[PDB]
Structure formats: C-alpha cells, structure tokens
Amino acid sequence: RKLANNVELKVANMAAEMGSLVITSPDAIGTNTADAWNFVADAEEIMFSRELNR
Amino acid sequence: SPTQEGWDLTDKATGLLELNVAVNMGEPDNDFFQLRADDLRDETAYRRRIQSAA
C-alpha cells in the first residue's frame, strides 16, 4: 500500500513541478461566485489558445 | 509501513510495529423496587412499572 502511495505522490509532484501553464488568481476560490469555474476555464482557455493537442 | 529510496540500503532495515486498542466494561444499570403483598392485589402498576423500566 505504501509503495503505491509513493508512486501517487511522485506523479503528483512531477506534474506540479514541471507545469508550464500557470493559472494564477489574486484571491481564494471561495471568494467570488464562480471562481472554481473561472479557474478551470482559464486552464481550458490557455490550453485552447496555445493550440495544444488534447 | 515506512519506505526508503535508493539502491544501497546497508544498515537501514527497519523493524515491525503493531499498535493496540482496548475496550473495557462499565457498571450495571439497574431498576430496583419493592412492594408489599397487599399491593399485589391489583398487579397493574407492577406490570406498568416493568414496561417503564425497560
């Protein structure tokens, strides 16, 4: 079980560290009405405009 | 369980650890009353007291 968990941690950390597409917000997600949607949608918008393969 | 990384693990083998939790017992809960023989001629209050005790 612990070895599986370590694999999970390594994958998550590599993703977070080598992530070029930084979506930034000045405030916490609970602040405005649809910050979570806006935040996912910023991710989608930058992936679309950069013309990445999805 | 703990895990470690690396090829060489000389003098780094851990041990085994099993924790324990104990359940115990409480005090008995009682319903105690008495009656005289002249009070058992009706016997209704006795049965109702048994029900209330449960």
Which method, experimentally, gave rise to this model?
cryo-EM
Please indicate whether, in this complex, the C-beta atoms of B3 and A2 are within 8 angstroms of each other. Answer: yes
d(CA B44, CA B32): 17
Residue B38 backbone phi and psi in degrees, to 5: -70, -15
Q: Using a CB-CB distance cutoff of 8 angstroms, which residues of chain B are in contact with residue A1?
A: 1
Contact B40, B46 (CB under 8 A): yes
Please indicate whether, in this complex, the C-beta atoms of A6 and B1 are within 8 angstroms of each other. Answer: no
- Give chain A's largest Cα–Cα span: 40
Q: Cβ neighbours of residue A35 under 8 Å, at least 6 residues apart?
A: A25, A27, A28, A29
